[PDB]
Design a protein around this ligand. Structure first.
Ligand SMILES: [Mg+2]
Lengths: 102, 107
């Protein structure tokens, strides 16, 4: 027997070369869309907690977001280098400048 | 005997069985010499190597009394890719010449 698993990030181009007949099926890996999923990811990653979490929710529940999961292990670790008073604001600003095309 | 050389082309959509209806005709012919020149035994070759291999497989068919040869998946022998388009010229020329070269007398 055998089994081949290939990973690609640009499906249309591969479809143009007639390389989507060779493969026998296809799976789709999505991104974080709903705010609740982002909150769950933050809860499980072990980061801002207590009132901080609350305020984030207050500003994020009434809107849609679009962010990958390898890009949310950098924003957390890029907004932790400030003083312990503006971390939340910097995280929100970075998400706003990143969460494009909701 | 007016025509010592013949040819045929099997065409259809993809995934339909045009390599198991072309081996069962050759098998049920009971000819002495039968060969299959497929594209999976020459992974990575350049143009000249493919030309030499094709020439050898055809030459070994000129030294019998009556023979059959199968060229399956043509469009992969001469690399094709819709972008461009791109492909190999030497292999196409070798093919276009080898389909009109009558074998020695009486074969
Ligand atoms: Mg085939």
């Amino acid at each position: 027997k055998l089994l081949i698993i290939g990973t690609t990030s640009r499906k249309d181009v591969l479809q143009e070369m007639e390389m989507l007949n060779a493969f026998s099926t296809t799976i789709h890996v999505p991104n974080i869309a709903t705010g609740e999923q982002l909150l769950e990811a933050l809860e499980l990653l072990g980061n801002f907690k207590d009132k901080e979490r609350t305020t984030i929710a207050q500003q994020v529940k009434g809107k849609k977001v679009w962010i990958g999961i390898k890009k949310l292990l950098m924003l957390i670790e890029m907004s932790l280098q400030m003083d312990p008073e503006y971390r939340v604001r910097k995280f929100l600003a970075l998400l706003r400048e990143e969460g494009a095309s909701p | 005997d007016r025509t010592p050389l013949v040819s045929v082309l099997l065409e259809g959509p993809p995934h339909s069985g045009k390599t198991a209806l072309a081996a069962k005709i050759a098998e049920e012919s009971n000819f002495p010499f039968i060969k299959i020149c497929s594209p999976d035994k020459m992974i990575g070759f350049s143009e000249t190597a493919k030309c030499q291999a094709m020439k050898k497989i055809f030459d070994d068919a000129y030294k019998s009394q009556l023979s059959c040869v199968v060229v399956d998946d043509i469009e992969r022998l001469l690399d094709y890719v819709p972008i461009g388009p791109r492909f190999s010229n030497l292999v196409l020329q070798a093919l276009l010449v080898l389909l009109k070269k009558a074998p020695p007398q009486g074969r």
